[PDB]
Ligand binder design. Structure first.
Ligand SMILES: Cc1cc(OCCCc2c3n(c4c(-c5c(C)nn(C)c5C)c(Cl)ccc24)[C@H](C)CN(c2cn(C)c4ccc(C(=O)O)cc24)C3=O)cc(C)c1Cl
Length: 151
């Protein structure tokens, strides 16, 4: 499943970057040109989203009470409930990933950086299992890049 693979590369990289503050110099895998542009887009847009929703993001994180690996393992069901139904658009997908970044920075703050990859995996799984058809119709990460493109 290539969509999964590409989504996970992008989301994992953005969350790690956000948590550690360091950009990764390594190239991407296949569809790497699009993935690189999608990561650059996430930088701009997702930092904006995290700033705009800081209060709701805080309250959610607080009620989630994330302290270790099993706490992280239990977040998929909340993620699905909040993300599954209703309107789908690129903004909501960016909100999913942006809150992922917010949680990743928390996880680094509490010395639980080892949970960031499973978090990424959980996010990607929920993204692809719930929005597959939609993402394919919108041309995947290419469509994401073009949607948020600023010349
Ligand atoms: C890693 C990870 C990712 C997650 O992410 C789940 C989906 C993304 C998401 C949405 N939310 C969110 C709020 C949030 C905000 C902001 N306020 N409150 C009161 C809350 C709870 C917050 Cl704090 C954090 C994420 C939100 C609101 C309800 C709007 N939401 C939408 C639902 N429906 C039908 C939509 C139709 C269009 C659009 C749009 O953007 O035009 C958005 C939505 C969303 O999916 C969840 C969890 C547990 C985790 Cl661990």
């Amino acid at each position: 499943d290539e969509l999964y693979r590409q989504s996970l590369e992008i989301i994992s990289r953005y969350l790690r970057e956000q948590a550690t503050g360091a950009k990764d110099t390594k190239p991407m895998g296949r569809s790497g040109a699009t993935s690189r542009k999608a990561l650059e887009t996430l930088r701009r847009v997702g930092d904006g989203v995290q700033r705009n929703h800081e209060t709701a993001f805080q309250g959610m994180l607080r009620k989630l009470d994330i302290k270790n690996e099993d706490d992280v393992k239990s977040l998929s069901r909340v993620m699905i409930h909040v993300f599954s139904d209703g309107v789908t658009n690129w903004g909501r997908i960016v909100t999913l990933i942006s809150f992922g970044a917010f949680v990743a920075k928390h996880l680094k703050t509490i010395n639980q950086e080892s949970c960031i990859e499973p978090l990424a995996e959980s996010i990607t799984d929920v993204l692809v299992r719930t929005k597959r058809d939609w993402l394919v119709k919108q041309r995947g990460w290419d469509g994401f890049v073009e949607f948020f493109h600023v010349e």
